[PDB]
Amino acid sequence: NSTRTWKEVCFACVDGKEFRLAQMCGLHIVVHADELEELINYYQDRGYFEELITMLEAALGLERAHMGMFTELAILYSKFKPQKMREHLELFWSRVNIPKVLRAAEQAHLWAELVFLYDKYEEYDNAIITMMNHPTDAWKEGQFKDIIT
């Protein structure tokens, strides 16, 4: 049950295209932050995003629910499922890497999410600029009156 076994057989299972098996077989690897990004790099080449997001949704139930898991989850929800980014990020904003997600969100740059995020992390100055340059989608009369102070 060592990490090496599950991670070695995950690639052969994905090549065999048994995502049911590989899903449960990879839960013991995602828990290791030093073994997560490699798996996502393997999978993006496969393009099986719809198939691995279920594994990531299952990773929340895993006891070792660490931060990099949520960073990658939000990274993929940002552009592959952008409607879900804000909603999923209502919770793990106090659980997820700030700058990597910020620069990663720059691609979709759904400015509302970035503004709300900066407002949560007290980095209000960036939110002011973001509301200044892209206000059509990301602007609110209410909060911009007091955040400015």
């Binding site: 993006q44 393009g47 995003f49 552009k79 979709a108 740059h109």
Partner: peptide, 16 residues
């Protein structure tokens, strides 16, 4: 299926 092919154009379409 080299999803980067669809992904580049999809992202550009979305942003444009």
């Amino acid at each position: 299926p080299e999803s980067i092919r669809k992904w580049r154009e999809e992202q550009r379409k979305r942003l444009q």
